Amino acid sequence: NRDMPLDSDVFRVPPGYNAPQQVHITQGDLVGRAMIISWVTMDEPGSSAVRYWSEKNGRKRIAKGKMSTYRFFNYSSGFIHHTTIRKLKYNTKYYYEVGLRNTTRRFSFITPPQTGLDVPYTFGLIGDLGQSFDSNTTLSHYELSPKKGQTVLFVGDLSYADRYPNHDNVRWDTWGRFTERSVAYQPWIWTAGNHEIEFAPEINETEPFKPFSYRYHVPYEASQSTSPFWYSIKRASAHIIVLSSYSAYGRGTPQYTWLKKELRKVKRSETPWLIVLMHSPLYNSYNHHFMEGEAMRTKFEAWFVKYKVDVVFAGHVHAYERSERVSNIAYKITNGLCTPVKDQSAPVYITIGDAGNYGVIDSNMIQPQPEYSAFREASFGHGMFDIKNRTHAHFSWNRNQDGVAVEADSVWFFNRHWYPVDD
Amino acid sequence: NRDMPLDSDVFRVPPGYNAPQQVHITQGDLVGRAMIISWVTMDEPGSSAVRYWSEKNGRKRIAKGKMSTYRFFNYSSGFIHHTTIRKLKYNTKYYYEVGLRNTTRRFSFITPPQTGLDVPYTFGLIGDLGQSFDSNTTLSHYELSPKKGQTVLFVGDLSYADRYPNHDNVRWDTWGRFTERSVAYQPWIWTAGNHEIEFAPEINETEPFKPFSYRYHVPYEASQSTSPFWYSIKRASAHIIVLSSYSAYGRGTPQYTWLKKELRKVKRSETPWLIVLMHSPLYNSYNHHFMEGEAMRTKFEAWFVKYKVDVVFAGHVHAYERSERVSNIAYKITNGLCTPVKDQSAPVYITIGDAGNYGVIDSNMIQPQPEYSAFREASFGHGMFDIKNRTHAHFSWNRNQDGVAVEADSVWFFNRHWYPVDDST
Amino acid sequence: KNRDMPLDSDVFRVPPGYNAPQQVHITQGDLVGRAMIISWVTMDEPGSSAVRYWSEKNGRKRIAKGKMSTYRFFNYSSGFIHHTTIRKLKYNTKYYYEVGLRNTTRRFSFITPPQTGLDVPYTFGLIGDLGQSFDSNTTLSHYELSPKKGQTVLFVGDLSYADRYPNHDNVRWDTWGRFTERSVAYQPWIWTAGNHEIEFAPEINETEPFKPFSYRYHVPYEASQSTSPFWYSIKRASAHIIVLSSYSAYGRGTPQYTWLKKELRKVKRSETPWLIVLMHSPLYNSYNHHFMEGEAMRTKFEAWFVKYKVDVVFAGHVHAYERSERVSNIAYKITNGLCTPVKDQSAPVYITIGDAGNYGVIDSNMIQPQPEYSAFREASFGHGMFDIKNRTHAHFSWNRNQDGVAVEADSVWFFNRHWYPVDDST
Amino acid sequence: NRDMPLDSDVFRVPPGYNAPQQVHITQGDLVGRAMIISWVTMDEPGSSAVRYWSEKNGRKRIAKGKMSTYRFFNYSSGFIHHTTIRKLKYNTKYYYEVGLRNTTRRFSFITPPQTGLDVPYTFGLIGDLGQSFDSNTTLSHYELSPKKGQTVLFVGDLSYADRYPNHDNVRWDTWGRFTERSVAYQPWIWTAGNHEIEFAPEINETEPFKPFSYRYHVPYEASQSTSPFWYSIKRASAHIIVLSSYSAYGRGTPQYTWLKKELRKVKRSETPWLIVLMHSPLYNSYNHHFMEGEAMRTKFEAWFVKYKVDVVFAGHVHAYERSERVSNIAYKITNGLCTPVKDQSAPVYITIGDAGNYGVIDSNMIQPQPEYSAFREASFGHGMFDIKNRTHAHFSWNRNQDGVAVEADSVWFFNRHWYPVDDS
Ligand SMILES: *[C@@H]1O[C@H](CO)[C@@H](O[C@@H]2O[C@H](CO)[C@@H](O[C@@H]3O[C@H](CO)[C@@H](O)[C@H](O[C@@H]4O[C@H](CO)[C@@H](O)[C@H](O)[C@@H]4O)[C@@H]3O)[C@H](O)[C@H]2NC(C)=O)[C@H](O)[C@H]1NC(C)=O
Ligand SMILES: *[C@@H]1O[C@H](CO)[C@@H](O[C@@H]2O[C@H](CO)[C@@H](O[C@@H]3O[C@H](CO)[C@@H](O[C@@H]4O[C@H](CO)[C@@H](O)[C@H](O)[C@@H]4O)[C@H](O)[C@@H]3O)[C@H](O)[C@H]2NC(C)=O)[C@H](O)[C@H]1NC(C)=O
Ligand SMILES: *[C@@H]1O[C@H](CO)[C@@H](O[C@@H]2O[C@H](CO)[C@@H](O[C@@H]3O[C@H](CO)[C@@H](O)[C@H](O)[C@@H]3O)[C@H](O)[C@H]2NC(C)=O)[C@H](O)[C@H]1NC(C)=O
Ligand SMILES: *[C@@H]1O[C@H](CO)[C@@H](O[C@@H]2O[C@H](CO)[C@@H](O[C@@H]3O[C@H](CO)[C@@H](O)[C@H](O)[C@@H]3O)[C@H](O)[C@H]2NC(C)=O)[C@H](O)[C@H]1NC(C)=O
Ligand SMILES: *[C@@H]1O[C@H](CO)[C@@H](O[C@@H]2O[C@H](CO)[C@@H](O)[C@H](O)[C@H]2NC(C)=O)[C@H](O[C@@H]2O[C@@H](C)[C@@H](O)[C@@H](O)[C@@H]2O)[C@H]1NC(C)=O
Ligand SMILES: Nc1ncnc2c1ncn2[C@@H]1O[C@H](COP(=O)(O)OP(=O)(O)NP(=O)(O)O)[C@@H](O)[C@H]1O
Ligand SMILES: *[C@@H]1O[C@H](CO)[C@@H](O[C@@H]2O[C@H](CO)[C@@H](O)[C@H](O)[C@H]2NC(C)=O)[C@H](O)[C@H]1NC(C)=O
Ligand SMILES: *[C@@H]1O[C@H](CO)[C@@H](O[C@@H]2O[C@H](CO)[C@@H](O)[C@H](O)[C@H]2NC(C)=O)[C@H](O)[C@H]1NC(C)=O
Ligand SMILES: *[C@@H]1O[C@H](CO)[C@@H](O)[C@H](O)[C@H]1NC(C)=O
Ligand SMILES: *[C@@H]1O[C@H](CO)[C@@H](O)[C@H](O)[C@H]1NC(C)=O
Ligand SMILES: [Fe+3]
């Protein structure tokens, strides 16, 4: 047992009567002009209003949202608030206050620049965080990093509350306050991992993504999606596609129908970097969860190659891996073409679900290291995808046992649309 | 277009005010002592009470049920009725009446025998029925069959209403009146196909399976399921498992979680025959929907072989095909072990989605016929799985263009747990 | 005896065109008069709930976003019902609005009121118990033809009488929406719930009180911080209007009772000098039909009305006409014998105005003799007019269906209780 | 002031993991063959199944029920259970059990006899109970009465939890655990009082009767009512009609409509005793809530006389009053007839809301005692309506300052339908 105890300093309750805790934000619209603020109040429902104003302008405005609550087995939640601030300006710092009529707390965020071809952005990559001491040091190596992350693409598995007796949802609240120091100030883009299914019918809890969906909203209707568990956002020069590994994706299902139609919406002249987020990797040579992503691979891989996805980011496997550019899309049951071959139109598959979880690393790998695999290692850490312009983006992996400025693995992503060089 | 016109005789409306229509029955519990009675009233809600009595004794009792309505875009449904009759006795003819308050109508069913190893039973196999003239021929061939089926395992794609403008749900209503002359007297076992999804966000009909799940209910709680789209039923000497090709089946999901624990519950020494139903086939050498069943095969194929399923029935492809007993469960990305090999531990895969649909057949086969494909032919028709004892089952395939008693293909099934011997033709 | 207009009447014709909006009606959507609820129904498919609206002055076309709802009643299924609120309008300007923007649109207009003030003149038409007989149609023709300009209808309950038809056949709600649209699409009607909107029919498994009416006709009840749509307050021009529900609870401690006790405290007679109460069931009524039915709510609310010097209480329910004297009956205490209404110049005038048509029957039988609290009564179909001249004066007038559209069978000058409490008896 | 502390013994938590608490039963159907078993589990949801059996047969049954929860402002309830036991034998002792998965608890009840003309039965009448020490004293006098109550007709106002900051619904839990020692073995027939309204729009709790209606169920569908707040049951020789004082009752409203039909359905030839329960008294000569009962009386009083109601019970006034058979139904606005008169066809109106509340008795009476008032006294206590046969019922009032066997007031009821004799 390596999760931080309940009295740990990261879980300290903010002082004040009905003081907002678990404050977290993510993108509110498709293009970054909106932001959705979320927080929990414990002592009474409280106001869902959010006071915000820009850094040097100070015209204080108010946005109204909605309160909701949920129960899980024995656990009754605090009063959860979700509020969307809209029509914000690009490249502008804002302040926002929350808990307006009782104990107010103020936070900050900087909206991204407007969607554009040559607009740089620094995305952090954090996967399978949990709330162990390893979870805390990874969040630390991230906030201290010289390259300065502006949004965290989170590839799934958040709290691991479901590891506790009856999924002790108090450990949802503790994870909420723990991550607040990062997610209250810059957006985290949510994808749903297996530890968010929380399908526990043996305690009459049979509705999937029950607590995760109540606590973490995404702007899924902005991309015409009919579920929060797959959606799309555009930010700076990135077009980001988030899939649900544990929702349906057969032919005709909504997510399948949505992804087919969203792919051909992508405009690489406006967003050169096509980034796909999912939880379970389609390419992974570790023994843990080996070949689990094969089902989705049969359904979606040829579309990734068809639309030249730059990179696919997954978690689930508690280690780090980086494939070569390969595709396994020629198999026809009896023709023998069942081996991945080098394909300059294929994405790079990176597994970055090594932020700590409950404190265990996946170290047993299939040996020998297959040819489709570039780099792999079982160490805790996080990733950084730093878009420079339309042709270059520098990815880097930071180990938890290294200094915050040390890159144990780094590659130049050459854009599949504007600069498809061998990499 | 080849669908029967609206004023066809198999579409006409039962006479009398608020006369029940679209009456269908299905097994209402795990072991076959219950039945779900389902019908619709068009003129007013009416009673959901069901009067029933055995022909032998004959004390007439009432079952209290539930009624529901729904809307699909600019369509408003009539009044759907669902009522479960329980504590029935085995191997007994029962009469039952609906429309008790105005226009009553009488039908009957025969409860199956109690489950035992050697209990014989005839299952009809229908898939992708629709409401074409081809569909009517198949229904007629099934009910004139000399081997007399006692239950229809239906492997998906029912009315094809989703092909009419705005999915004109009136063609759900017509399909109920059409298929009533069979499913009102014997239970059909329902699988959700791809034409039941009806995900239509352009007219904000985004709740998958909404019309199908309103009209056709299913005893999914009896097997501890949390969804109607996957469940199990025991009936005579068989254990049937119905799966949802178009629901989540990833590791850790409800259907995935439900299936692996249901397979552990199967006692072959009590139900010898293990049958699995899905809409999209895992083995399919027809070009239509080629390799669509791969994503499920990657997850469930090894389970079918380890628990030694007897037969997997599917549709989706609008033709017939019987497979050899093969498995493809040794693939490891880089090892090249990706060809189906003979496997006497594996089930036989039958595609049986040639009941008629909207009148087109799938004849573009991948050539040459692959080694995993025993028999295939592009003809409309149905199939029959005839269980004799714990060891033998006779599967035959009847064509619409042949006589009702002619079998153009037949294979004797050796039970995987009681007669583990090669049964290839 | 069946005096209801047949369905092929010209008042019931369907607006042509694929999914033409119909049953278009408007009512105030705020407290002060800067908002409009635009209500309509589409029969062919859902369609857009969006309203295009602009003023004849500026001309800027803006869009308001609304909400789509449907309902069933027995074997009836409704069309696609739309409610959209237009907000932040300018006062005293004429607005055009368009609805049905995705296929065939239809244009109407309204004139927002002046904003509330002490001497703002305004004309209120008074229609009750309308229904859809031919008599109903003569009344609506007369109000439209009135020489002085009715700017808003205050409706004191009982709209379509669809509940008289077998299974309440709510085709007769659609019929009524189309029938009245010719007036309510261009000036707001302020709705009161009557007994015919209850539609409590357990014998056909239909136990939701007020449902068809509540789905089709919305009110700005949250603007007055009311918890229910059946009691609410609005302010228009120099008038503060309090709509009560005769067929909801009103015991001490109930929401209606609680809400009303507080709402009187908010009245500002120096902003809205005219204090108007609407309720379906009359507290004063000397007809045999529904005699003394108002006695229960009179015991709870009469004293408050007098305490706050209410100017008038308009009611329907009785299918005829009556205007009370300024009387009160608030001194009863079981054993003190004081159960006679007395002259009370602080009390409102009670006017019964439920004679617009209904299913075509008048309530002609009366309590004899005419009691002292009754100042004028007649069993005639007609409609009324409350024309505010200023803070001291307001002219009420009753007009019969059998007279010229300018002939006032009854007419009285209302002297304002807060600003000019002169005796204004018959 | 006088509300019993949380550490009191009446509020103690039954021991054991997830032990059922606040157990309380009530008539489950129209005739007495059913019983609604209700309890709250605090540690986890638990099973809503009830295991029951009769002493005559001792064959144990399982009855499945429902589970529910609610929030109120800033309070989150435990897991409320409601299960209906049916087709019970008449006049039979049944044992029932709750908490079947972890901590099991066992209780017992005796079903009433089949409804009949001369079937005796002894009802207790508690009103405005509360949580004070005066409340515990009334409950003691009830359970110690040599007359032995068999069911409680409770004329409303249960916990008074709405007198606490934001109605602190922990005070509903305590009241549940305190009244259990009577209501777990004996059915209480629930009337809704004004302290159940809990209309607190300022903390966005605007659903009237929310905490009450979740915690206490009534067989209101058995008499074709569409609302828990008005309903009727038959029990032994009594037809009992429960009315909702704080709901709509205008002409055409549901409760008005339901009451109109229900009085026409009374068969005095089988249940000759016509009992009506409301919270607000139609007859009251006390200062407190004087004349508040007027509105409903102007609506329902003539019906009560026309159908020969035997007695109407009410609380709300924290005292005791017994009216004469009196009527005030001749008023026609201008005829001056607004003075109650003797009327042997009218019911007796009793105020019995003196069970304790929060400990404040309503002492101030209007003087002198009007003619319609036969007896009145401001003392804490309870009442008993003891049916002997179709002819006779002996009502008696017990004061908490007297012994448990002393009747400070008592009177013999002659049945209005079967014995229209002056019962002065
Ligand atoms: C419905 O219920 C009524 C009250 O419960 C009942 O009226 C009572 O009837 C009893 C008789 O059962 C009355 O008691 C008798 O009255 C005189 C009074 O002095 C006594 O002498 C008499 O002595 C008894 O005599 C019996 C032999 O004849 C024998 O049991 C003993 O000797 C015993 O001492 C009784 O005590 C009582 O006063 C009545 N109460 C009233 C009128 O309030 C109704 O009759 C009953 N209806 C029926 C039974 O149909
Ligand atoms: C389980 O059930 C299966 C049923 O498919 C059994 O396998 C079948 O067994 C039957 C015999 O019961 C056999 O058919 C018979 O072949 C006989 C050849 O002589 C013919 O019978 C003749 O006609 C008369 C009727 O029995 C009789 O009077 C006469 O003496 C003569 O025998 C006739 O052709 C029968 O149909 C099938 O060939 C066989 N099917 C196979 C092997 O696939 C199986 O044996 C049963 N198991 C147990 C333990 O009972
Ligand atoms: C549900 O919506 C569909 C789609 O609108 C309705 O079908 C359509 O109904 C119209 C009648 O209003 C049909 O009219 C066609 O259009 C021209 C006008 O340009 C008309 O003059 C022609 O005679 C022609 O028929 C249209 O064909 C039809 N479309 C279909 C059936 O695909 C349908 O009636 C609605 N159903 C319900 C139950 O509301
Ligand atoms: C509340 O009740 C449930 C069931 O009524 C308790 O759990 C059940 O009981 C035991 C564990 O308590 C589980 O199996 C048993 O293990 C014990 C060893 O402790 C042994 O004697 C037997 O071999 C027996 O199989 C059982 O699976 C379990 N079931 C479930 C669904 O939990 C539960 O512990 C109770 N909670 C408490 C007391 O807090
Ligand atoms: C996009 O960013 C890349 C990295 O920032 C550019 O490549 C780098 O440019 C540096 C000049 O600032 C140079 O020293 C590096 O050698 C070079 N290559 C690296 C870091 O791998 C990239 O391309 C450059 O841009 C133009 C203006 C010229 O300098 C070229 O010679 C370079 O290739 C940038 N591309 C664009 C379109 O901005
Ligand atoms: N007509 C009236 N007669 C007496 N008191 C009245 C009357 N109208 C209003 N009141 C007030 O209502 C208050 C009653 O307190 P209240 O909260 O309404 O119920 P309560 O005192 O708790 N009695 P109860 O409802 O049985 O618990 C009294 O103290 C009076 O000030
Ligand atoms: C939710 O229910 C659980 C039961 O599983 C409670 O945890 C147990 O409580 C009992 C006594 O209350 C202890 O003996 C156990 O050791 C506890 N832990 C277990 C069983 O893992 C828990 O307290 C409840 N939570 C809330 C918020 O009420
Ligand atoms: C309020 O309006 C009334 C009615 O219009 C005014 O009284 C009238 O005053 C005019 C003079 O302009 C006279 O000719 C009429 O005879 C009056 N009518 C009546 C019925 O007396 C009154 O002056 C106005 N009060 C104001 C403006 O304060
Ligand atoms: C988590 O890390 C921060 C530094 O990043 C430290 O201040 C804090 O005490 C740590 N909390 C733990 C280890 O519980
Ligand atoms: C209704 O009223 C109008 C008068 O404005 C008229 O056009 C119509 O013919 C009248 N009668 C009927 C039956 O519609
Ligand atoms: Fe993980």
Ligand SMILES: [Fe+3]
């Ligand atoms: Fe098909």
Ligand SMILES: [Fe+3]
């Ligand atoms: Fe009327």
Ligand SMILES: [Fe+3]
């Ligand atoms: Fe009280």
Ligand code: NA
């Ligand atoms: Na996975």
Ligand code: NA
């Ligand atoms: Na077919």
Ligand code: NA
């Ligand atoms: Na309360």
Ligand SMILES: [Zn+2]
């Ligand atoms: Zn995972």
Ligand SMILES: [Zn+2]
């Ligand atoms: Zn298909």
Ligand SMILES: [Zn+2]
């Ligand atoms: Zn009326």
Ligand SMILES: [Zn+2]
């Ligand atoms: Zn009270």
